[PDB]
Design a protein around this nucleic acid. Structure first.
Lengths: 47, 128, 61, 328, 91, 335, 90
RNA sequence: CCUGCGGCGUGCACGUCCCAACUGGGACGUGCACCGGCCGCAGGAACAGCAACGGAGCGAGUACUCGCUCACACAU
């Protein structure tokens, strides 16, 4: 998607469109996972 | 030197030319001095020419204090799409304009004699 | 003009006629900028002043 | 913690009061009353609307009532405050909260330099005209072009704006000013009031997992991490601590009176929204100040503040008005 | 049709098929409000009003045999005096 | 701990407490949290005077910029002299007279016609002009004005030009002082520049702002409808009365005082110790607003040990009438 | 008519003849000064110095030169062109 | 009696031209500021009151109104 981000030493969100951060690690997407109410995988995710 | 001289400048002294660009600007002003109406010197003349609509590249002096005498002109140049850049000192601008007396800022127009350099410098600033 | 000054550690004005302060930096002119009542550069002055964090609103206290 | 932080820094009017065994600390409430007096900082998904993302939470938590303090567009993610039951009384007070978004804008044509976009964002600052998308004045406090891709002609800028601002209209206006046009292809609210992405943001999966852990394991740790007390929404409000004998009077509609103030905070001005706080840190009500702090340091009686919205329920503390030194 | 006309403002720039006019009169125009010339010649309709509360701009969608390259720098634009509101009203 | 409270509430707890019993009224605002109209109407500006214009020009320019009915200034700086210049705005104009006697610190540049022996000569010459000196206005009723301190901050011998800082009483003409110093050194001299470095309790570090600052603040308030700039520029008039002893009065006596009533004892909440007879004091509300300037007719001990009698006599009512309601005449003794 | 002792010669700042004053009365502006023989030597040009120990600079005619007077030379002034000191005191 | 209010051709800035710095000079036009006592008007004649009879919580209609309940609280 368009909005990605990385984190600095203080754990603050730095917003970029680049797939690679300044430090070489990949940038994490800024949007949460899509939600479906009929999700029966709570136990598996907890495990 | 140059790093110290740039150090003395004010915090609003941005964008700043490096050493090589500084020599290029001094060369441009010295070449443009040969033409009376194609170089504008001083605060009042430069401001009036900007008001009227004159174009070119405007060269500021970064070691000035108080800054309220010129702090507004960078924004006017930005508004009219006139490239501009600071230089380490006013004495250098004066020395490059054939006048030991310093000039706070200057405005260089385009002439066929020195088009190439005048557009190299323009390109160099636009990449900063 | 004649009067100039440099700021000491405490923040006070130390007045002098010299162009260069004892610390090697230039000495700031003591006198404020001239004022024209028909000054149409207020907007153009707040953009730059804000851009460089010098406006009064941006200072502490 | 929450609302007793730096309580010794406040001006002490009196220390003498009779502590009562009633009431609970804001963070040590039972699980049945934590949820009722709590709010969630939801990271809204992309597609669903805000009233349907709040209906999902209401259905999930089996709570009687649930509200939110600002409508996020169906296609817009970011911070979303969901107040649970007794916290919904604060929704109105939360409408004017300052917002912070991070927007992505695509320009139809190209610009010469990033400086052009920076200047355009600079001139879209202060009070600005905004029209709701398919005329009002709303303030943009700050902005900052975080990134720009010329080949894509798409940029990222962070904007601090007043509640009610339309970032779609602001991006359209940024396009108009730059002479090339533009429109917004993505939005994400990164802070809502005093709450941001670092301040305890939980995914909808996190809420689902918490409610599920509570139901199938009777563990309230996760749910307490997910849900925060409403006192965290009034930390920016100025405080007026009242004694344990005056709380119930305020809960019944009585005006805050000087003889019952245990502590008050510097910087209280007339017609100022304040929070009444008990000595344990609970939020009795939101009040309007009718006396400056100096007028309270220099008087022995009167109305220190009138009520605006009672938060605490009646009969939380015993009725103890009319038993003062006089009782005449 | 226009019984009277007053100068709305001066010219700004062009953004695609729109004509930005810098508004000098404090009064805030109406939406979908026709913009006339000096000779009472409607040239377009209002589309967007943007900017601060005392130095702002308005885009017009030239429609009837009107174009952007037709107009030129320093041109002035007029508006029906009845199609305005006071600046205070919105504020 | 009220030592940090703004303006006239400083050390409010240290003031002697006469009574705590009154009913506050909802009328009025704190000096710093006033509306913008009242804040401007009851404000003053510490202006770095530009070199060229005259003080009256500066005041009129401020009037036109802020669109205020009245404005004044305490000390007049010659056209070519920069420095501190306190300008009052529509209601601090009543305090212009009280600021006329304020002390003044200048920094002056002088040129000597002929070279002197050495710097110590100039130092001694300055050390000889520190007293109740004799001063005649420049281009004629000879006056006497005091020069408390003086110091030769710099002296360039090549140009024969020096810079000296002088603290002096109001009305003193430092141009006359420079010509007199020239006469004293045996070579003659004159003043080249002058810069007022302090006017009263106001100086260069005490929030001095430029005219450009005033204009920019006005633009920000009239275009972005923002007030922070104008609030940094203009300051409440109570900043001019922070050196005065304070007498806090009940809110029922404010309107009486505005209408001309003398400050009577039955309506005093607090007072500052050290008040002597025939002393200038400021009558203040509990919100911090300086209702008026008065002349004390009771000592601190008398004010503590008495139950009736006029506490102070009006000298200048600052507060506008009808700001507070009329509450004189409803008390027990009054009827 | 008559004269009284004003003081003794100090220095000369160009034409101006600086005279220290020993009396407690402050003279006028341009008040004429005269020597022992009641010969006018100039008019008062400037008054300066501390309130008590003060000096007066006097402008002379072409009739005289400032250097013409030696150290210790005493001056006379009109007793009818003086002001009380209590007048200028606060 | 007290209070408040009013009366009793130089420079500055801007715009345009000649010449010889963040400048001083000139000319041509604009604005802006200047070269204690008496009188008039108006307000009040002031010993400084007021420790609860209009608030809160619900539902409906268009910030207001319409109904219900709770208390009408100076906090020992």
């Amino acid at each position: 998607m368009y909005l990605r981000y990385y984190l600095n030493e203080n754990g603050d969100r730095q917003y970029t469109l680049a797939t690679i951060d300044p430090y070489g690690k990949p940038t994490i997407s800024a949007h949460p996972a899509r939600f479906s109410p009929e999700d029966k995988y709570s136990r598996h995710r907890i495990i | 030197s140059y790093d110290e001289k740039v150090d003395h400048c004010s915090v609003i002294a941005k964008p700043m030319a490096p050493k090589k660009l500084s020599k290029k600007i001094y060369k441009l002003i010295k070449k443009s001095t040969s033409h009376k109406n194609y170089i504008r010197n001083g605060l009042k003349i430069v401001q009036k020419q900007l008001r009227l609509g004159e174009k070119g590249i405007v060269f500021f002096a970064g070691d000035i204090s108080p800054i309220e005498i010129m702090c507004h002109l960078p924004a006017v140049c930005e508004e009219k799409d006139i490239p501009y850049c600071y230089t380490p000192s006013r004495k250098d601008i004066g020395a490059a304009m054939g006048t030991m007396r310093g000039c706070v800022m200057v405005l260089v127009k385009e002439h066929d004699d020195y088009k190439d350099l005048f557009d190299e410098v323009r390109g160099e600033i636009k990449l900063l | 003009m004649y009067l100039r000054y440099y700021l000491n550690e405490n923040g006070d004005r130390q007045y002098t006629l010299a162009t260069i302060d004892p610390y090697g930096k230039p000495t700031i002119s003591a006198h404020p900028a001239r004022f024209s009542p028909e000054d149409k550069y207020s907007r153009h002055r707040i953009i730059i002043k804000k851009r460089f964090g010098l406006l009064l609103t941006q200072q502490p206290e | 913690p929450l609302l007793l932080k730096n309580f010794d820094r406040l001006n002490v009017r009196t220390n003498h009061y009779t502590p009562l065994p009633f009431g609970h600390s804001p963070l040590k409430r039972p699980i049945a009353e934590y949820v009722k007096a709590g709010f969630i900082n939801v990271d809204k998904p992309s597609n669903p609307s805000s009233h349907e993302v709040v209906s999902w939470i209401k259905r999930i938590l089996k709570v009687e009532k649930t509200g939110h303090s600002g409508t996020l567009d169906p296609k817009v993610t970011g911070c979303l405050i969901v107040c649970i039951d007794r916290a919904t009384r604060l929704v109105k007070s939360q409408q004017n909260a300052g917002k912070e978004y991070v927007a992505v804008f695509s320009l139809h044509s190209a610009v010469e330099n990033v400086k052009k976009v920076t200047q355009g964002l600079e001139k879209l600052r202060g009070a600005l005209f905004q029209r709701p998308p398919l005329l009002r004045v709303r303030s943009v406090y700050d902005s900052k072009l975080l990134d720009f891709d010329k080949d894509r002609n798409i940029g990222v800028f962070w904007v601090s704006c007043e509640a009610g601002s339309y970032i779609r209209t602001m991006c359209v206006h940024l396009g108009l000013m730059l002479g090339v046009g533009g429109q917004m292809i993505e939005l994400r609210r990164v802070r809502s009031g005093i709450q941001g992405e670092k301040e305890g943001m939980v995914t909808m999966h996190d809420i689902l997992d918490a409610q599920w852990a509570y139901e199938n394991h009777k563990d309230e740790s996760y749910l307490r991490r997910v849900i925060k007390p409403l006192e965290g929404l009034l930390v920016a409000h100025k405080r007026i601590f009242i004694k344990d004998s005056a709380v119930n009077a305020v809960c019944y509609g009585a005006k805050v009176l000087l003889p019952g103030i245990l502590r008050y905070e510097d910087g209280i001005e007339i017609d100022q929204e304040i929070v009444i706080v008990t000595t344990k840190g609970e939020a009795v009500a939101l009040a309007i100040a009718l006396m400056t702090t100096s007028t309270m340091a220099s008087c022995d009686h009167g109305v220190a503040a009138k009520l605006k919205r009672v938060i605490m329920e009646r009969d939380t503390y015993p009725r103890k008005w009319g038993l003062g030194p006089k009782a005449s | 049709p226009p019984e009277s006309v007053i100068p709305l403002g001066h010219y700004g720039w062009t953004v695609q098929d729109d004509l930005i006019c810098k508004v000098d009169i404090e009064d805030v125009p109406y939406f979908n409000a026709p913009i006339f010339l000096e000779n009472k010649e409607q040239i377009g309709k209002i589309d967007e009003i943007f900017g601060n509360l005392r130095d702002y701009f308005v885009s017009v969608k030239m429609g009837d045999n009107f174009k952007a390259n037709s107009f030129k720098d320093g041109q002035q634009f007029y508006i029906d005096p009845a199609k305005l509101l006071p600046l205070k009203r919105f504020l």
